[PDB]
C-alpha cells in the first residue's frame, strides 16, 4: 500500500541514518587509554609533618597534608551549623556527618586522625586548583579563580563552591606510604 | 522599482555565450549595483571590515596550520618556530590574534548600530537572527583558538567554561567528558578544538552568505523609519562605486589603525601568562579568560546568593536550580533575549532618531556593556558586586520591559518622509 | 629618571653592545641556574642582535653542556642547532626564554635583580634559606609584616634567588665600568632579545605599512570627495 | 517549457513571510522539481555517488583529525592510536582509505559516460571545464592525504611526485623547495599537506555547487542527441520523486558493497609497505604510487628514448626539452586535451548511440585507459615499454585526430526524434 | 593443506587458546631480540583476543624491562599503561606490532618461521653469521647460487635471524603436543591479533551493514518499480 | 583629472595587495632553521673495506663505499663512450670528464684513487635510494622506483635517470675520517 511503503520506506532510511551517525558521537568519549584511570602508591617518606605534599593522578593533584595543632584545633571547633556541605565528601566512608573525626583519614593502621588529611586538590565550584600553605580567611585553602574559602579539614566556606573538599578512597602501607585507588 | 537592470547580455559576444553560467549576471544585476539610500552615515561600513577582516583571519590561519603541531608536547615550540625562524611568523600571529580582537570590536558596533536604527525591527528578523547565530559561532571558534598556543590561560580557560557544561544536573558530567575527550582537558582536546577551529570560519561563510542574500533581498535599513518608495526612486544611488570607495576609505584608515597596533602595541590585549608553558598543578592570579567574553563571565559569576536582591534564594524553591545553573541560564537568557528582541519591541515605529527616551535607555545600555567589560576582571569583593548586579539587571529590564513600554507611550516625533533628505 | 631602554619606543633598534654584555653576563652568571630552551644559538649571528662571529658562536656552542640525541642516544658534541640547555631542577629556576613578555617586562628585570637589600625593620632575622627583594610580589611573607587581612605591609616578598652579583663581578672586553646597575640593563636588553628577536623588523613593517596605507586612504578620500560632489553642492 | 513552478508562496502564512528570505523558494523551484527527461538509463545516477562519497569522506576527515597529529614522530602512533583505542577507528579510516578509491572510480564512470553520449559537446562546455578543474584539485588532495600516515610509502611517493616539478628548467629546484619547505621531505611537507588536505575539499563543494548551477541551466544530456523541446512538455518528468528514489537505489546497493569490502576486503586496494615506518635511508621495492595515477604515472615513464618511436631524439633538437621536461609535458598535455575535447570534435551531431566507428574508437579507448592502468605497475623492461607507448600514443590520436575525422565523415545513422522514446 | 586460520573468512573470532600459547611462545622466546611498541599490556584483558586475567597483566608487565619515564627520569615500575618494550639494535631486528600487515599475512610467518633448512647443494659451506630460510625474499645470495643475469636460483635467501624453535622448546599448560609447527601457528595468530584487534567488531559490523542496506536497498526498488509503472506498462 | 586620479588610485591598490600577497608565498619557502644545512665527520673506522658505508645528513643519505678490484677494472675500462653522463657531477673539482681517475676520491691526504667513493645515495631521476651490493646489469647500483642503472663509478646507465651520482665536497681528516661540507 502507498502509505504502507512509503511510510516504511522513509523509517528505514532514519534508522540507518541514526545508526551511521551514533558512532560519530560514540568516538568523542573516553577512549580505551583513558578507560585505565588506576592508582598511586605516594610515599610520605618525612617531609616535614605540617607543610603540604602533592602528587599528581588521574590528570588531577592528589593532596596530602599532614597537621598543624592551631590548624587542628581550629577544625575540631567547627561545629556542623554554619557549614555548608556537612556530608564528608570522603569516598572511604559513608554519607556520616562533616566531622573532623571522620574526615582527618585512617590511622597509620594505628589509631589516630589528627594528624593527615589527603583530599583531592580540585575545587567543586568548577575545578581550579586552591592555593595552600594557610591562605585565605579561615586559615586553610583559597580559590583564585572566583574566591572560594576553605577551612582546615577542606569544607568549603565563603564562596559559591557548594561542596567541600572530596576524599578519594585511601588506606595506608603500615605507616610509611599511601594508596591512591 | 528595486531596478535589477540584469545588463540583458547585449555586450557582445563573449556575454551572450555566458548564457551557460550566468554568474556574471549574478554579480551586476545584484551584488554589485543594489540601490542603496544617500542618507548613509559611517555606521554602515563596518560589515565590510567584518568580511575582510574574516578573510584576514582565515588566509593567516591556513599559513599558521603549516607550521602549528597540534600537541601538548609541540604546540608552544612549535608557535616559538613560528615567531623565530618562519619569513614573517611574528605578522601572522599578531595578525591573528589581534584581528580577533578587532573582528568582536566591528561586531561590537554593527550590532549597537542596528539595536538604534530599528534593524532588527520588521521586516529583517531574518538578518538578526543569522547574525545571533553567527556571533555564536564566532565566539565558540574564538575560544577553541586560544587554547591552541597551550600556554597557561588556555588551559584554564578552558577548564571553566568547560565546567559550565558541567554544572547543570544530570548531563553535565556526561557532556563535560563527550567535550573534552576525557575526565579533564589533555591533547585529546586540543586535536578536537584545533579540528574544529579549523572549520567553522567555513559555515561562518556561507551564513554570511545568506546574511548578505537576506539584506539584498530586504533593503538597507537607512538612517531613518522609511524605505526606498518603490514605485522611479530618484533617490538610492547604487553601491558601486559610491558606498564601494567610501567603505574602502573607512577600511583603509582601519587597516592603518591595526597595523600600528600590529608593530607598535601587539602583546597589549594579551594577557602575559599565555607566554609561560601550562602547569595543571598550578594556577595563576587572576585567569581574566579575554575581553570579548567578560560581559557573560560577569552575569555568570555575579549571582551567587549575596544581596538582598538575590533571587538565588528564591530560585532554591526548586532543590534543581542552584545557583552556578542560574548562571548559566542567565548568561544564555542574555543572548536569548537580544535574539528575541525583534517580537519584544512593540512599536510600529523605527530608528530612535525620533523616540527620545529610548535614545536615553540605548545609552545607558552603552554605558552598561562597557562596565560589564570592565567588571568581569575585577574580583568578586564589595562593592563590584552590587556593580555587576545591577547591570545584568538592567541589561534584561531593558530587552524585556523597557521596550514595550516605549512601543505603547513613545511617539512625541514628526517621523520623517522622502528619505530624499537633501538639508 | 625611568631609565628607558633604546627600543622603547617607535624606534630603536636593539644597541648590539648593550646584547654582548648581557650574553658576557648572562652565559657567565644566570645560565648557572637558568635557561632559554626555547632560543637556537645560531640567532647569536642572525641580524638585529648581536651579530656576533659564526665560528665563535660553534666554538661556545660545542664548549656548553651535553645534549644528547633524538635518535641514537648517544652524547654529542651539541651543534649549533641545537637550544640552549635547561637548568630544571634542585635549586633551579624557570625558563628565561620569553620572560621577558610573562610580565612593561624587561623594567621588571631591571627594578628585580636591582634590589635584595637586607631584611626590614619589622622581621631582620628573616627566612632561612629565602631571601629579601623590594619588587617581587608573588613571594611569601611573614605574618610579622602582614597587616590585619593578610596583606603585606612590605613593597616586594621574598624571593628564592639569591643576590646575583656584587660591585665588580665581571669585566667588559670593550671597557666599561661593570657596576650591577649597567649588568641589569644590558641582561635585561639580551632577555628582551631572546623574547622579541624579530622587533626591528615588527618596527620597519609598521612604518611602511602607515605610510601605504595613509597614501591609499588619502586618494580614496579625494574619489570619494569627487563622486560625492554633484550631490553635496546646493547646500 | 522549461517550467519552473515556484509555487507562488500561496501555502499558506508560513510560505508568504519566508518572502523574507527566499531559500525554499530556490530549492522547490529549481532543485527538486527540475525536469529531467524520461530516456535516462543506469549511468546518469554516479553523480549522487560522488556527492555522497564526498561528504562521507569530509565527515570522516574532520572526525579523524581530531586523533592525528601531524609530525613524523606521532602521525603512526596517532594513526594506531585511531585504529585501536578510538570507538569507531578502524571504520573511519577504512571508510575514509576506501571511499577514495569509490570516489575515483565514480567519477572515472561520470567521465566515461559523458565522452560517449557528447555531454562535452556544445552547450556544455562550463560543466566540462569545471569537472576537470575539480578532478586535477581531488587528484592533489588524494595525494597530500596519502602521505599523512607517515609510512614507507607515503615518502617516496611525494619523493617522485615532487621530483617532477624540478624536473622542468631554470624554475624547476626553486618550486620543490618551495613546496618541500625545504630540500627534501620532512616535518613541514607534512604540515602543508595536512593543512591543504583539509582545506580543498571545501573548493570542491563551491566547484561542485558551480557543477549544478551549469547543468540545471543547461539541460541534462539524455541518451539522445536530443533536447526537451521547450515549447508543453509532456515529456521530461521532474526529478523528485522519481529520479530521486532511483538514484537512491543505486546508491544503496554501492553502499552495500562498499561495506562489504571495507569488512571483509579493506586491505585490498592497499600497499601493506605504507604499514611499515619510513626510512630515507631503504627504499622498497615496487613504489606502485597509486591506482588511480597509474595511466599518468606510465605515460610518464613510457618516453624514454628506447624506441623506433622515440619522439625523445627529435625533441633535442632543442637543448633544453630532455626526457623528463617530455614526460611531464605529455602528462599535462594528457589533461589539457582532455579538457579541450569539446573544440576538437567537429560533428554536428551527438551520442555515439547514432555513431558506429566512434563506438569502436571509444571501446578502445577505455582498453587504453584498463591497458594504462595495468602498466604503471609493472617495471619498465621489454615488452611493456612498447605496449605504453602504444597506449599513449593512442589516447593522444583519439583525441587530437580522430574526432575532426569522425565529425566530418560519420553520419550514416537515423537520428531519434522525439525524446519521448515510447517504444 | 593450505593449514587456513580460525579467522580467514567471513567468521572466526580468534580462537583465543590459541592466542594464549602464541603468548607463552612470544615472550618466552621472541621477545629476545623483537619488540612490540605498538602493542598496550591493557590489552590482554580487552574482549577478543586473549581476555587474561587483569592481575595477571600487571604482574607480567611489572617483570618486564623498565621504561623510565616522560617527565621525571627515573626508572619505574612499567605500568601496563605503557607499551610493550623495544629491542632496537645490537643482533636485533625490527618491530612486530603490524608485521602481520606489512606482508596473505600470516602465511608468510607460519611458512617463513617453517623452513631454515641446511643450505643446499649448490653453496653447502654457507655463509659465516648468516642462516638459511626457504621463504625470506629480501635477503642476499652467493654468486654460486645466482643465474646469469643476478636472479637466485634458490626458493629463499639468506635471512639475519637464527632458527627461534627446535623439536619441544616449551610446555603448554593446556595440555598439547608443542612442536614446531602448532607453535609457528599460535605465534602467527598471536602476531594477527597484536596487528588487527578489532577484527570480530569488523566482521560483525559489516554483517550488519550488508543486512541493513539490503534491506533498504529491496524496499528502494520496490518504491522504484511503484512509482515508475504507469510508464512502463503499455511497452 | 579623472583618468590620472581613478588609474592612480587603482595602482596604488594593486602596489599594496601585491605587498600583502608576498609574503604568503615567502613563508613558504625554506626557513631559518633549515638554512643551516652545515657538516658532518663520518669515520670510516675499518667498516671491512668492500661492502658499503652509509650515513645520514642533509635529510639524505651519503654513500661511502670502499673498492673491490673487479668493481674496480669494471670502471676504468669504462671509456667516455656510451656514458650518458660524461662530467664527473663531483663537486670537489671542475666538470673534468666523468673519469675513474678523477671520479674516485681524494686520496687519503696520500696518493691513491682506486679504493674509495663516497657519492650522494640520490637518484637524479626524481630522487629514489638505489640498492647496493652489486646489482643491476652493470654491477653497480639499481633505482626500483623506475628501474635505472649505475655503473661501479655511480655514473648513469640504462634508465631514464639522466646524469650520474654526484659527489658532494669532501677531504680526508688524515687516514681516518670524512668531511661531509
Ligand atoms: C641560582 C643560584 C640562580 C642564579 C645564579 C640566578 N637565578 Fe634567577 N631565579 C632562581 C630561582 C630559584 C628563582 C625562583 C624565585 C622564586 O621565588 O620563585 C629565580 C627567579 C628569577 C626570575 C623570575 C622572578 C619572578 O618574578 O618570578 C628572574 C627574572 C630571574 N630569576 C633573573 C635572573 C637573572 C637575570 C640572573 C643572572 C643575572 C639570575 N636570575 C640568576 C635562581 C637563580
Ligand atoms: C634473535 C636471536 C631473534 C629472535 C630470538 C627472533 N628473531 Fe625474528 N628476526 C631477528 C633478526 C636479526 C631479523 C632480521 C632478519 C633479516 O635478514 O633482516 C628478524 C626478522 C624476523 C621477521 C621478519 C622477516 C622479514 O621478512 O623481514 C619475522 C616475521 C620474525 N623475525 C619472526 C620472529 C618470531 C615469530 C620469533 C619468535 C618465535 C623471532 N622472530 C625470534 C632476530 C630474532
Ligand atoms: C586555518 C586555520 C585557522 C583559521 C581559519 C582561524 N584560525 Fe585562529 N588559530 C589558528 C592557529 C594555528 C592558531 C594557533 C597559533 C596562534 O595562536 O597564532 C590559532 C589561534 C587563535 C587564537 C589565539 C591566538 C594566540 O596567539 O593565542 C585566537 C583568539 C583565534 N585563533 C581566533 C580565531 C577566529 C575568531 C577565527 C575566525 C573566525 C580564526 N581564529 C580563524 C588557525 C586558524
Ligand atoms: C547579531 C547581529 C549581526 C551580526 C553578528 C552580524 N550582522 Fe551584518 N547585519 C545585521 C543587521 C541587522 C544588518 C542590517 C541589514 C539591513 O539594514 O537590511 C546587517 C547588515 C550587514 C551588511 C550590509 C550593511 C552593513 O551594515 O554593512 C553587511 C555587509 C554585513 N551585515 C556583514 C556582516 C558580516 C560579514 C558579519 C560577520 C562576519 C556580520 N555582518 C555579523 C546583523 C548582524
Ligand atoms: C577533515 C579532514 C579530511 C578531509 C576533509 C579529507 N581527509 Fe583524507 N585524510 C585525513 C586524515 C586525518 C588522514 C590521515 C589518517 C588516515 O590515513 O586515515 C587522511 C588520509 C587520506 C588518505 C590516505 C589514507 C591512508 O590511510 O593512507 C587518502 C587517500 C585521502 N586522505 C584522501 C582524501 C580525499 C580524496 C578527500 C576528499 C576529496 C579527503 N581525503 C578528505 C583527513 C581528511
Ligand atoms: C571531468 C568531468 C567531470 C567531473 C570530474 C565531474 N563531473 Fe559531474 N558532470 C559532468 C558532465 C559533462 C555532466 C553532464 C551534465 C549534463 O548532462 O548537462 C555532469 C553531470 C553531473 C550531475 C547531474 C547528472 C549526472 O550525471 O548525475 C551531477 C549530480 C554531477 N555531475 C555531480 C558531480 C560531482 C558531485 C562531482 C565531483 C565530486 C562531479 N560531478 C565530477 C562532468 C564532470
Ligand atoms: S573554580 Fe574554584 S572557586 Fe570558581
Ligand atoms: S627515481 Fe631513481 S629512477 Fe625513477
Request: aromatic content about 14%.
Amino acid at each position: 500500500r502507498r502509505d504502507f511503503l512509503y511510510h516504511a520506506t522513509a523509517a528505514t532510511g532514519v534508522v540507518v541514518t541514526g545508526a551511521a551517525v551514533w558512532p560519530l558521537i560514540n568516538q568523542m568519549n573516553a577512549s580505551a587509554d583513558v578507560k585505565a584511570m588506576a592508582s598511586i602508591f605516594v610515599d610520605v617518606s618525612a617531609v616535614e609533618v605540617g607543610t603540604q605534599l602533592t602528587v599528581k593522578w588521574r590528570g588531577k593533584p592528589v593532596f596530602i597534608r599532614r597537621r598543624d595543632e592551631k590548624d587542628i584545633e581550629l577544625a575540631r571547633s567547627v561545629p556542623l551549623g554554619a557549614l555548608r556541605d556537612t556530608s564528608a565528601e570522603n569516598a572511604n566512608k559513608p554519607g556520616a556527618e562533616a566531622t573532623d573525626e571522620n574526615r582527618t583519614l585512617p590511622a597509620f593502621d594505628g589509631t589516630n586522625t589528627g594528624e593527615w588529611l589527603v583530599m583531592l586538590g580540585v575545587c567543586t565550584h568548577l575545578g581550579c586548583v586552591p592555593m595552600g600553605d594557610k591562605s585565605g580567611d579561615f586559615g586553610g585553602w583559597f580559590c583564585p579563580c572566583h574566591g572560594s574559602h576553605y577551612d582546615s579539614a577542606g569544607r568549603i566556606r565563603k564562596g559559591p563552591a557548594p561542596r567541600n573538599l572530596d576524599i578519594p578512597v585511601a588506606a595506608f602501607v603500615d605507616e610509611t606510604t599511601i594508596k591512591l585507588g | 522599482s528595486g531596478i535589477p537592470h540584469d545588463h540583458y547580455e547585449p555586450k557582445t559576444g563573449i556575454e551572450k555565450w555566458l548564457h551557460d553560467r550566468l554568474p556574471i549576471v549574478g554579480l551586476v544585476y545584484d551584488t554589485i549595483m543594489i540601490p542603496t539610500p544617500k542618507n548613509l552615515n559611517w555606521w554602515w561600513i563596518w560589515g565590510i571590515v567584518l568580511a575582510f577582516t574574516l578573510v584576514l583571519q582565515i588566509v593567516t590561519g591556513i599559513v599558521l596550520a603549516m607550521h602549528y603541531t597540534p600537541h601538548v608536547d609541540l604546540a608552544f615550540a612549535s608557535v616559538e618556530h613560528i615567531m623565530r625562524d618562519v619569513n614573517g611568523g611574528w605578522a601572522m600571529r599578531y595578525i591573528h590574534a589581534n584581528g580577533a580582537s578587532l573582528f568582536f570590536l566591528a561586531v561590537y558596533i554593527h550590532i549597537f548600530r542596528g539595536l538604534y536604527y530599528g534593524s532588527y525591527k520588521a521586516p529583517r528578523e531574518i538578518t538578526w537572527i543569522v547574525g545571533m547565530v553567527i556571533y555564536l559561532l564566532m565566539m565558540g571558534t574564538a575560544f577553541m583558538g586560544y587554547v591552541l598556543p597551550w600556554g597557561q590561560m588556555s588551559f584554564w580557560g578552558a577548564t571553566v567554561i568547560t565546567g559550565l557544561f558541567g554544572a547543570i544536573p544530570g548531563i553535565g558530567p556526561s557532556i563535560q567528558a563527550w567535550l573534552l575527550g576525557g575526565p579533564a582537558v589533555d591533547n585529546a582536546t586540543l586535536n578536537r578544538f584545533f579540528s574544529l577551529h579549523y572549520l567553522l570560519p567555513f559555515v561562518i561563510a556561507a551564513l554570511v552568505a545568506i546574511h548578505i542574500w537576506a539584506f539584498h533581498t530586504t533593503g538597507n535599513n537607512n538612517p531613518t523609519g522609511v524605505e526606498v518608495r518603490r514605485t522611479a526612486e530618484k533617490d538610492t544611488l547604487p553601491f558601486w562605486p559610491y558606498f564601494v570607495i567610501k567603505d574602502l576609505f573607512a577600511l583603509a584608515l582601519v587597516l592603518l589603525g591595526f597595523f600600528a597596533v600590529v608593530a607598535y602595541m601587539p602583546n597589549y590585549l594579551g594577557h602575559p601568562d599565555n607566554y609561560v608553558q601550562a602547569n595543571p598543578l598550578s594556577t595563576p592570579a587572576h585567569i581574566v579568560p579575554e575581553w570579548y567574553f567578560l560581559p557573560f563571565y560577569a552575569i555568570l559569576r555575579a549571582f551567587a546568593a549575596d544581596v538582598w536582591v538575590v533571587i538565588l534564594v528564591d530560585g532554591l524553591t526548586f532543590g534543581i536550580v542552584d545557583a552556578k545553573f542560574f548562571g548559566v541560564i542567565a548568561m544564555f537568557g542574555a543572548i536569548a533575549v537580544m535574539a528575541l528582541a525583534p517580537w519584544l519591541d512593540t512599536s510600529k515605529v523605527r530608528s530612535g532618531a525620533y523616540r527620545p527616551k529610548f535614545r536615553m535607555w540605548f545609552w545607558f545600555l552603552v554605558l552598561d556593556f562597557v562596565v560589564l567589560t570592565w567588571v568581569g576582571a575585577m574580583p568578586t569583593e564589595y562593592p563590584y558586586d552590587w556593580i555587576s548586579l545591577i547591570a545584568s539587571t538592567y541589561w534584561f529590564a531593558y530587552f524585556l520591559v523597557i521596550l514595550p513600554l516605549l512601543g505603547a507611550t513613545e511617539k512625541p516625533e514628526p517621523i520623517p518622509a522622502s528619505i530624499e533628505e537633501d538639508f | 629618571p625611568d631609565h628607558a631602554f633604546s627600543f622603547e619606543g617607535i624606534f630603536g633598534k636593539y644597541d648590539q653592545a648593550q646584547l654582548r654584555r648581557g650574553f658576557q653576563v648572562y652565559n657567565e652568571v644566570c645560565s648557572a641556574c637558568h635557561g632559554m630552551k626555547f632560543v637556537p644559538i645560531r640567532t647569536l649571528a642572525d641580524d638585529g642582535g648581536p651579530q656576533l662571529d659564526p665560528t665563535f658562536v660553534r666554538e661556545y656552542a660545542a664548549g656548553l653542556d651535553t645534549i644528547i640525541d633524538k635518535d641514537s642516544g648517544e652524547e654529542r658534541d651539541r651543534k649549533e642547532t641545537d637550544m640552549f640547555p635547561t637548568r630544571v631542577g634542585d635549586g633551579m629556576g624557570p625558563d628565561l626564554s620569553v620572560m621577558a613578555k610573562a610580565r612593561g617586562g624587561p623594567e621588571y628585570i631591571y627594578n628585580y635583580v636591582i634590589g635584595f637589600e637586607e631584611n626590614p625593620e619589622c622581621a631582620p632575622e628573616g627566612i632561612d634559606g629565602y631571601y629579601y627583594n623590594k619588587t617581587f610580589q608573588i613571594g611569601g611573607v611573614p605574618d610579622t609584616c602582614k597587616d590585619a587581612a593578610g596583606v603585606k605591609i612590605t613593597h616586594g616578598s621574598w624571593a628564592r634567588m639569591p643576590p646575583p652579583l656584587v660591585d665588580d663581578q665581571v669585566t667588559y672586553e670593550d671597557g666599561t665600568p661593570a657596576t650591577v646597575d649597567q649588568m641589569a640593563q644590558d641582561v635585561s636588553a639580551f632577555l628582551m632579545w631572546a623574547a622579541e628577536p624579530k622587533l626591528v623588523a615588527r618596527k620597519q613593517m609598521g612604518l611602511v605599512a602607515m605610510v601605504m596605507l595613509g597614501l591609499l586612504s588619502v586618494m580614496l578620500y579625494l574619489t570619494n570627495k569627487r563622486l560625492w560632489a554633484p550631490y553635496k553642492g546646493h547646500k
